[PDB]
Amino acid sequence: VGAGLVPCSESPEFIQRAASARNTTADPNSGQKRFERYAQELCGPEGLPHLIVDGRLNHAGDFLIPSILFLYIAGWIGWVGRAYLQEIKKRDNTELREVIIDVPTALPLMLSGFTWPLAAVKELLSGELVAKDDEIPVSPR
Amino acid sequence: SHSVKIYDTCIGCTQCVRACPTDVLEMVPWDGCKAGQIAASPRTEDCVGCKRCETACPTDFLSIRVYLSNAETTRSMGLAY
Amino acid sequence: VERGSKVRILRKESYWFQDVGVVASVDKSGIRYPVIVRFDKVNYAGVNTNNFAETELVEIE
Amino acid sequence: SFEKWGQPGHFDRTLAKGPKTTTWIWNLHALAHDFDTHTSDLEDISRKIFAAHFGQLAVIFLWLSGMEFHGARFSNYEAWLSDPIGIKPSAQVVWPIVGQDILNADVGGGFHGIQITSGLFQVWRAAGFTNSFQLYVTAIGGLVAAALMLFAGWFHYHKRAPKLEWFQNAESMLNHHLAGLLGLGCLSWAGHQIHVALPVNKLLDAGVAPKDIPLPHEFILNNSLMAELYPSFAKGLTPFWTLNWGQYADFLTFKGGLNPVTGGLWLTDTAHHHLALAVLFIVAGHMYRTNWGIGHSIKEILENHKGPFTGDGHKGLYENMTTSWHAQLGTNLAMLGSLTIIVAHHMYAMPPYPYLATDYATALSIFTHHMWIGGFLIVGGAAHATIFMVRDYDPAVNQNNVLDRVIRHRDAIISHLNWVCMFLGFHSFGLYIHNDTMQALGRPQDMFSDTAIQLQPVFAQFVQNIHTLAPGSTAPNALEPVSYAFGGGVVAVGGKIAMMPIALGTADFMIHHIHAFQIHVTVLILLKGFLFARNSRLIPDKANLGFRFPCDGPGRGGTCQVSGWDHVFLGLFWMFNTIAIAVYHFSWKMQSDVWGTIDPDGTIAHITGGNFAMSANTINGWLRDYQWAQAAQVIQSYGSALSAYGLLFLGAHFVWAFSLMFLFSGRGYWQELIESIVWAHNKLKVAPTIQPRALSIIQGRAVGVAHYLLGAIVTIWAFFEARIISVG
Amino acid sequence: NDVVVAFGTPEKQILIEPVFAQFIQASHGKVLYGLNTLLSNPDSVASTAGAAWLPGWLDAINNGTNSLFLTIG
Amino acid sequence: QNYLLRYLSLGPVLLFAWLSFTAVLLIVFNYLYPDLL
Ligand SMILES: CC1=C(/C=C/C(C)=C/C=C/C(C)=C/C=C/C=C(C)/C=C/C=C(C)/C=C/C2=C(C)CCCC2(C)C)C(C)(C)CCC1
Ligand SMILES: CC1=C(C/C=C(/C)CCC[C@H](C)CCC[C@H](C)CCCC(C)C)C(=O)c2ccccc2C1=O
Ligand code: SF4
Ligand code: SF4
């Protein structure tokens, strides 16, 4: 947290901005409150805070858990999409329904993405995620 | 002018001979497949480079090709002046 | 490898090389390309049907 | 009865089966309307056109009534009523959430929102609008009429559809429309004007208690107040029964000029105008032959006009004008476009509404809007002309006619045309850059303005002059000149100019000449595609093959871009240039020596200071002395309450470069990249069944040109919008 | 950044801060940031090495007044 | 009848539906507690 960066608590220009900090929304405490919420980080001569990313508990949670949340949701959406696609093909109405979504079937697949990570891990160990270099017949060259 | 290239995949539908407006093809007698008469280029000198012919070739990896040469002339360039 | 069997292709320049199609009609005449196979994946204008010499085909199952 | 929509491709037999690849999507949005490409029948076509017209009218009514309603409940009209100067109209109040809270366009009286520029209140300063409830009723009427005529379209298509001979009575068409539509509507609007408009206008001179001013019902049968003014307007004295019209000199007069108490002209002139037009084209539209065995046999008129150079004249032209549709489409589009641009070129010297020349914001917005639409659609008129040429013609009914006589000697025409274009082009631009070099070369005596080598457009000066002293002799019963840019006195109000005479010195010459230059080359491209549409000296199968196709192989070298709509591509690029520099010129002059402020001496202190006589002669000056002013605030024009609208000019450049990306590149490259990504996806078992395929080259060209135009026009409107906000 | 600053509040906008180049900078021997590592630590194992005339090099690099590995953001 | 969904399920109309759902989703959390940083 070095590099010549003053704490946002005691950076004079920080509170100087905080004084007439333009309260954005329809509540008078909007601006001031957020500046109060910006005492944990450490400002600089620009008067605005920089973010440190190291796992260092000074700013660890301020970047780690959002990353993990994104991984959660991206895994969910990718998993349910792939599962839906795999399911459609066992109907022999393939491209008919490619544009007409079968809602009574599209729902439970979406609702059943609860345990995507570890299940995916299983498909990794079972090897249920990849087809074989030559079995996949998509010809290169 | 330019060079023409023939192959074996000529099924013999003869859509190319009806497509070339430049009279550079003819179906010479063959024996191999049910065609019995395969296309060929007897009159290359009037080639134009439009290559509307292979677009009329339905065969997988269309049976005719044209190797577009470099010895062009007033005929191969097609000028009325 | 008979009429109605799924086989992959040995012809190199083929658009569906190594891809599996069904033997629609087993011809065996004097033509160099007897076997008529049908696919569903589309090359130029959908030539999902084609002919080969059955010395260029191998079954899967 | 809802079992029918979700069956796509209902109109085409080919794309109705199924979406093999993504291509099936694209054509879905491409052939949804050209139902001439569906059958050979015509009654169906006509019925479809009727229903589509009804739908367009319905959306018209909807949007106008909704805009009213916004004007009633969220617009500071009735406060801006009492003061149209010290208040700037607005609408579309900002919604108070994160992101749009600082954008409160406060225009006095605490009314926040969005400071609009479309001058509807100006109409609402002439229509005499007091309370918003009547306006509420107006919107209700508009929307109910919309729904009504939509239902009418449904009925006239599904239950009782018209027959086929109902089409080609152009005679009754012209008669009914010309007379009944135009004359009756115009005379009705004039009657509304005289009854209500000028009365409340009178009543808007000194603060005469607007809402307290009576309602029209207080004047339907109450002639007393109507007898207050205009003594002849007791009832009317009805001297028309006695054929005497001298009594009516009260309201139905002829002034012809600026009325410095209204910010516009004298409305009585407009009323008498509308009267005269009404009866004039009523008796006009009573011309052609119809069901009473009396009139012109119009297909014989064109038969008569022939002669030595004519060949056989205008013989055989009606099969074209009625059997085919694209013809009519193209011609009417061209005419409308021209008409619209003259309208634009018209209503900045004769403001026909109250508070127009005094309101220096709505003027150029309206001007440029209409001007852009004009060209933007006349090119389409020419395109439909070409599509007629490829779709509809006849070798039999077109023997030696004035039509055929040009298609036989096209080469001379177009060669001489190219000649003219080259001549004018460098004769103007190379002259310009010559003077540029001279100024950069310490040889200033070789410049071309008044202070140097001379040239003076005497013709415009003399025509303006002979226009200056028109009244009295040419116009005895006329009081003031038609405008004040030709001649007269500098008419104004406050410290704010309304109209002064315009000066034409030296810089006018090359500007008008390059205008003509670009118009010439535009015509060149379009007409070239027109004539060389069916047969070229090398391609004799064009019409035998179509008019929308990319190329004809690498024969004869290259042949790419040999269709016609690529000709109109190039043409639309060029017309973009034309109209862009045209609006540049107009804005700069009418902000340089026409507009500014005024002192008690009538001293017009213009905005810029007459910069054409100083810099509008060399190129480097043209960038300096125009866009320095046109942007020096947009950089900082953001950052407060009535500034926060960070404009998407910074944003439009991106779409412009993204545009030009599509132009310079082929497609096979993208196809191969697509195939590689497909390989990867197939390796991870996510291969989309519908196999993606790259765009077709014509599709890519279209999206490129679309994005190009969009970015450019967005950029420029952002420019002068913020520029006017800096002064208005 | 563009939209957030386009609302008048710049504090709602992200600022990253590179530190890998900072670490390599100090680790070459820069003291500005005071990490005491590898010629910022004048007592490490390699703190008696480098050039056999590293004092002048140190006077130079410490004098970052010239164009010698300027700070970043 | 309920056949309307048979003719309302097209994809495009469903696209905008899902996108607007997710949009108001993103709004309410930005509308209810836009004060957590
Ligand atoms: C330009 C424009 C516009 C506008 C438009 C207009 C403004 C129009 C007008 C229109 C009109 C203005 C119309 C009107 C009409 C009217 C009429 C057509 C009338 C008729 C009448 C009659 C028919 C009568 C009848 C009767 C009676 C009533 C009584 C008894 C007797 C009788 C029977 C005779 C808009 C914005 C949209 C868009 C953009 C552009
Ligand atoms: C990019 C590009 C392509 C790539 C081809 C395609 C089809 C790219 C199109 C990608 C999709 C169709 C764009 C979708 C735009 C949407 C904003 C994406 C939203 C999708 C999610 C929201 C679901 C060409 O094929 C091409 C051909 C000839 C000249 C120039 C070009 C060219 O510039
Ligand atoms: S090349 Fe094509 S058209 Fe010619 S014979 Fe062979 S299959 Fe027929
Ligand atoms: S370009 Fe093609 S069609 Fe034309 S002559 Fe050559 S081979 Fe024949």
Residue F27, CB half-sphere, CA atoms under 13 Å: how many? Answer: 8
Look at chain D and count its residues.
728
Are B and E neighbours with ≥3 CB pairs closer than 8 A? no
- The answer to whether the beta carbons of residues D263 and D354 sit under 8 Å apart is yes
Q: Does ligand 2 come within 6 angstroms of the Cβ of D695?
A: yes
- Which amino acid is it at C52? F
Helices (H) and strands (E) in chain C, counts: 0, 5
Per domain, the residue ranges of chain B are 1-81
Give the distance from CA D157 to its chain's centroid.
Answer: 32
- Which amino acid is it at B60? D
3-class DSSP state of A95: coil
Look at chain F and count its residues.
37
Using only the alpha carbons of chain A, give its radius of gyration.
Answer: 25
Going from the C-alpha of D245 to that of each of D233, D250, D269, the distances in angstroms are 12, 11, 16
Q: Does ligand 2 come within 6 angstroms of the Cβ of D693?
A: no
As a whole number of angstroms, the distance between CA D619 and CA D436 comes to 7
- Provide, for chain E, the percentages of residues in helix, strand and coil under a 3-state DSSP scheme, each rounded to the nearest 5: 35, 0, 65
Using only the alpha carbons of chain E, give its radius of gyration.
Answer: 18
Residue bearing tokens 């003027």: D363
- The answer to whether the beta carbons of residues D524 and D421 sit under 8 Å apart is yes
Residue D318 in tokens:
């009606």
Residue C51 in tokens:
């002919």
In the DSSP assignment, the letter for residue D167 is S
> Left, alpha or beta for E50 (phi > 0: left; psi -120 to 50: alpha)?
left
CA angle at residue E49 from E44 to E50, to 5 degrees?
A: 120
Q: How was this structure determined?
A: cryo-EM
Pick the closest to residue D386 from D586, D637, D567, D580 (CA basis): D567
Which residues make Cβ contacts (< 8 Å) with residue F32, sequence separation at least 6? none
As a whole number of angstroms, the distance between CA A13 and CA D61 comes to 56
Q: Where are the alpha helices (DSSP H) in D127-169?
A: 132-158
Ligand 2, atom 7, lies closest to the CA of: D694
Q: What is the largest CA-CA distance in chain C?
A: 30
Going from the C-alpha of B5 to that of each of B34, B62, C33, D385, the distances in angstroms are 21, 11, 21, 44
- The answer to whether the beta carbons of residues D386 and D529 sit under 8 Å apart is yes
Residue D151, CB half-sphere, CA atoms under 13 Å: how many? Answer: 6
D353 annotated to bind ligand: yes
Q: Beta strands D496-499 and C57-59: pairing type? A: unpaired
Pick the closest to residue D146 from D262, D61, D233 (CA basis): D61
> Left, alpha or beta for D9 (phi > 0: left; psi -120 to 50: alpha)?
left
Q: Does ligand 2 come within 6 angstroms of the Cβ of D700?
A: yes
Counting atoms of ligand 3 from 1, which one is nearest the CA of B57? 2
Query: Which-ligand-closest: CA of B6?
Result: 3
In the DSSP assignment, the letter for residue D643 is G
Ligand 2, atom 5, lies closest to the CA of: D694
As a whole number of angstroms, the distance between CA D169 and CA D180 comes to 16
Going from the C-alpha of C56 to that of each of A107, A136, B7, C7, D368, the distances in angstroms are 46, 19, 19, 10, 70
Resolution of this model in Å is 3.7
Q: Does ligand 2 come within 6 angstroms of the Cβ of D667?
A: yes
As a whole number of angstroms, the distance between CA D54 and CA D149 comes to 6
Query: Which-ligand-closest: CA of B61?
Result: 3
- Which amino acid is it at D658? F
Residues linked to residue D505 through DSSP beta bridges, in sequence order: none
Counting atoms of ligand 1 from 1, which one is nearest the CA of D181? 18
As a whole number of angstroms, the distance between CA D714 and CA D654 comes to 11
Which residues make Cβ contacts (< 8 Å) with residue C61, sequence separation at least 6? C6
As a whole number of angstroms, the distance between CA D19 and CA D691 comes to 10
Which residue in chain E has the smallest CA separation from D637?
A: E6
Per domain, the residue ranges of chain C are 1-61
Residues 1-60 of C with CB under 8 A from A: 8, 15-20
As a whole number of angstroms, the distance between CA D531 and CA D382 comes to 12
Residue D297 in tokens:
């046999």
E6 and chain D in contact, CB less than 8 A: yes
DSSP D364-377: HHHHHHHHHHHHHH
3-class DSSP state of B26: strand
Q: Cα distance from B74 to chain C (closest Cα, Å)?
A: 35
Q: Where are the alpha helices (DSSP H) in E1-73?
A: 2-5, 20-28, 54-62
Burial (CB count within 10 angstroms: exposed 0-12, middle 13-18, buried 19+), residue D656: middle
Going edge to edge, which strands form the sheet with C49-52? C49-52, C35-38, C20-26, C6-9, C57-59
Which residues make Cβ contacts (< 8 Å) with residue D101, sequence separation at least 6? A24, A25, A26, D94
- The answer to whether the beta carbons of residues B64 and B3 sit under 8 Å apart is no
